[PDB]
Amino acid sequence: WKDADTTLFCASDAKAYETEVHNVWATHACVPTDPNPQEIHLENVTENFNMWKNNMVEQMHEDIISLWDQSLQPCVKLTIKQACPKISFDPIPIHYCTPAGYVILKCNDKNFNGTGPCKNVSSVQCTHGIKPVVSTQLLLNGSLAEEEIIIRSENLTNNAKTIIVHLNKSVEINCTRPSNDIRKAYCEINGTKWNKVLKQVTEKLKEHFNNKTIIFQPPSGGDLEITMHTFNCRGEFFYCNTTQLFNNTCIGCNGTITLPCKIKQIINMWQGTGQAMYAPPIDGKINCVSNITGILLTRDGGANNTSNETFRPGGGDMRDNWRSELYKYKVVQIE
């Protein structure tokens, strides 16, 4: 093989009858999953990949952009008025497959950080059931670390680049908007479970920073979407204040940590650049049961001449959410 890139295609397990809109777009944009797909570990052939220079991330990105533009349509989009009926919405696993001529190579070593030489390399024709979850700060409904928690970064020293933390435990949030404000919402997280995981996070993160005294803090400057944990639940965008996770120390607090949320009608687009307003949340209890499997953080710019390094959660670029699950695939050209 040789390093090359070709516009791949997708594969879904969707249903042709459901009107949940992830299915709808995937049914008429992807083919059925390969019934019998097979992996083959190349006998001691070692290959090196790197996510931050992967093209399927960019290509997958373009997919969900076009998907949402087809799907989540706004009443008004300042980037034009349209129709905005409230629809069903729930992530579906999506696979990606090379066309005739190329093959995806996947890394199987449990300690891989996503940059450098993998030894246990195998060959696939399609990816795995990647769930395209759009969310900020923390990583939702993603994979799971096959060993220790892993810190993924294009360049640890460069602080303008984002840092992804892949958790080996799936700590969990439980967000709800009960019925008769119509926009009051709240997520509940087990305090000691997430804090036992984060006290591990800082200790398996200090090791990359010369045993410098690490420390966590809340976002310093932003536009809600980056400062507040923003995601989509049952078609509604949820802005949730996560100051109780990176500030409520405990590194008298082992109960259910409860964070507040608001349902924002106006949303600064994650796809292009601009605002887009919708309509009120539909009546009835709106509950989503999601898994935190990772977090996105941004280092300090300036904490050089210090004994510390404060970390703040990262947002904006949704490519890193795509990178998090695509950290193990690289498309190669068979020759």
Ligand X SMILES: *[C@@H]1O[C@H](CO)[C@@H](O)[C@H](O)[C@H]1NC(C)=O
Ligand Y SMILES: C[C@@H]1CN(C(=O)N2CCC[C@H](C(=O)Nc3ccc(Cl)c(F)c3)C2)C[C@H](C)N1C
**Lookup result for tokens 């949320």:** 261
- List 173, 261, 267, 292, residue binding ligand Y (CB under 6 A): 267
94: helix, coil or strand?
strand
Q: Is residue 205 a contact residue for ligand X (CB under 6 A)?
A: no
Piece in contact with ligand X (CB under 6 A), picked from 24-32, 64-72, 76-84, 136-144: 136-144
Of ligand X, ligand Y, none, which one does residue 273 interact with (CB within 5 to 8 Å by kind)? ligand Y
Q: Is residue 159 a contact residue for ligand X (CB under 6 A)?
A: yes
Binning the chain into helix, strand and coil, the percentages to the nearest 5 are 15, 35, 50
258: helix, coil or strand?
strand
Q: Is residue 223 a contact residue for ligand Y (CB under 6 A)?
A: yes
CA distance 191 to 205: 20
Across-strand partners of 32? 12
Q: Is the dihedral of CA 62, 64, 67, 71 positive or negative?
A: negative
Residue 90, Ramachandran bin (φ over 0: left; ψ between -120 and 50: alpha; else beta)? beta
Cβ proximity to ligand X, 115 vs 310, nearer residue: 115
Q: Where are the alpha helices (DSSP H) in the chain?
A: 21-27, 55-70, 191-206, 319-326
- List 25, 194, 216, 231, residue binding ligand Y (CB under 6 A): 231
- List 126, 261, 318, 332, residue binding ligand Y (CB under 6 A): 318
Smallest gap from residue 236 Cβ to ligand X (A): 10
Of ligand X, ligand Y, none, which one does residue 193 interact with (CB within 5 to 8 Å by kind)? none
Report how far Cα 305 is from the mean position of its chain's Cα atoms. 33
Residues 31-90 that bind ligand X (CB under 6 A): 41, 90
Smallest gap from residue 81 Cβ to ligand X (A): 28
Cβ proximity to ligand X, 204 vs 319, nearer residue: 204
Cβ proximity to ligand X, 126 vs 228, nearer residue: 228
Beta strands 2-3; 9-12: pairing state: unpaired
Q: Is residue 239 a contact residue for ligand Y (CB under 6 A)?
A: no
Q: Is residue 227 a contact residue for ligand Y (CB under 6 A)?
A: no
Phi, psi at residue 306, to the nearest 5°?
A: -145, 175
- List 112, 194, 216, 270, residue binding ligand Y (CB under 6 A): 270
Q: Is residue 108 a contact residue for ligand X (CB under 6 A)?
A: yes
Q: Is residue 236 a contact residue for ligand Y (CB under 6 A)?
A: no
* Short-list 157, 310, 158, CA closest to 220: 310
Q: Is residue 136 a contact residue for ligand X (CB under 6 A)?
A: no
Q: Which two tokens stand for residue 106?
A: 């996947």
Residues 310-329 that bind ligand X (CB under 6 A): none
| Contact call for residues 254 and 280 (beta carbons, < 8 A) | no
Cβ proximity to ligand X, 192 vs 200, nearer residue: 200
Q: Is residue 92 a contact residue for ligand Y (CB under 6 A)?
A: no
| Contact call for residues 242 and 255 (beta carbons, < 8 A) | no
- List 23, 98, 127, 135, residue binding ligand Y (CB under 6 A): 135
Report how far Cα 166 is from the mean position of its chain's Cα atoms. 10
Contacts with ligand Y, residue ranges (CB under 6 A): 134-136, 223, 225, 230-232, 237, 267-268, 270, 273, 315-318
